[PDB]
């Protein structure tokens with residue numbers, strides 16, 4: 001099923017989501033959340049989603065793009081569940097990008113983030129990873145990992161001049 | 172008649188509007204602009220408006236809120252034309268306030284501006300003033316005068332946490 005997405009302004013979006021236990025991942029309730037998250041993300045045509053975005057303060061992320069409409073210039077991201085992620089920048093180099101949050105509808109803003117990061121997470125199965133990510137994925141990943149710390153891209157705008165509504169940025 | 176209002180993102184909103192000549196104020200075309208600005212502001216239920224907001228880069232402002240049946244908690248702002256305004260802060264004291272711009276629809280943000288300023292302008296008749304303004308008016312005035320220097324309140328947000336959509340801030 002599809003859940004409602006919290007819009008910027010609601011304080012839930014600024015609170016810190018907490019860890020997921022090695023037990024919760026087996027609860028029937030959990031499996032349903034994931035499903036919802038996905039079904040929810042897919043609906044709004046997003047590339048990722050964070051538990052809080054729907055109201056749950058748990059370190060749970062969902063990514064993956066179904067190689068579809070809009071973005072015929074945006075690479076793909078494999079479906080995957082990210083739990084209790086922890087990131088570390090590897091370089092001071094930056095890659096600019098116009099981000100848009102689902103919680104901040106109709107607006108995009110220019111945001112520079114590091115382009116080489118070491119992330120450590122865990123999947124629905126319990127396998128723990130520790131690889132080094134780069135390019136677009138790192139961007140996605142970082143954006144999502146931010147919500148877990150109660151942070152929206154708007155907090156990182158390089159220059160407020162470079163921020164506006166889609167309707168008019170496309171002109 | 173009513174004119175269209177530029178939304179944040181359009182670059183016109185970031186360019187510097189230029190002065191109005193002692194002649195332009197007599198042009199029949201001018202008088203029409205004013206009428207339009209007002210009729211426009213009145214429609215969107217605003218307290219003020221700047222030429223650029225409708226597409227004209229001329230230092231022209233329009234203010235005015237009579238029967239405050241719309242917004243209570245605030246003073247009255249008498250109808251008036253402000254031309255070629257120049258402000259100077261008089262104190263370092265600040266007064267907080269949740270501003271909303273017509274160019275940034277459906278959103279408010281907390282903004283602290285000085286509360287004692289010396290403004291100098293000129294009216295449709297050509298009379299030049301130089302008085303010291305304070306309280307809510309100064310806020311309005313400063314807000315409006317900002318749009319002439321190509322600045323939106325969003326540029327002055329105290330803390331990005333304190334910024335969101337009306338729909339959800341009223342909770």
Ligand SMILES: CCCCC[C@H](CC(=O)NO)C(=O)N[C@H](C(=O)N1CCC[C@H]1CO)C(C)C
Pocket residue numbers: 045046047048049050053071074098099100101102103108139140141143144147
């Ligand atoms: C680095 C993360 C990239 C964006 C992630 C968001 C999902 C989100 O809001 N997470 O919190 C998204 O799908 N955003 C879309 C977006 O801004 N996109 C999708 C393709 C790239 C970019 C537009 O250039 C909007 C249109 C819904």
Ligand SMILES: CCCCC[C@H](CC(=O)NO)C(=O)N[C@H](C(=O)N1CCC[C@H]1CO)C(C)C
Pocket residue numbers: 216217218219220221224242245269270271272273274310311314315318
């Ligand atoms: C500094 C306050 C002056 C605001 C001027 C704007 C008009 C504007 O955006 N001009 O550029 C306005 O009407 N703003 C309204 C606004 O923010 N108001 C109106 C009453 C006080 C304040 C919020 O309550 C919006 C909500 C329509």
Ligand SMILES: [Zn+2]
Pocket residue numbers: 100101102103143147
């Ligand atoms: Zn987001």
Ligand SMILES: [Zn+2]
Pocket residue numbers: 271272273274314318
């Ligand atoms: Zn404004």
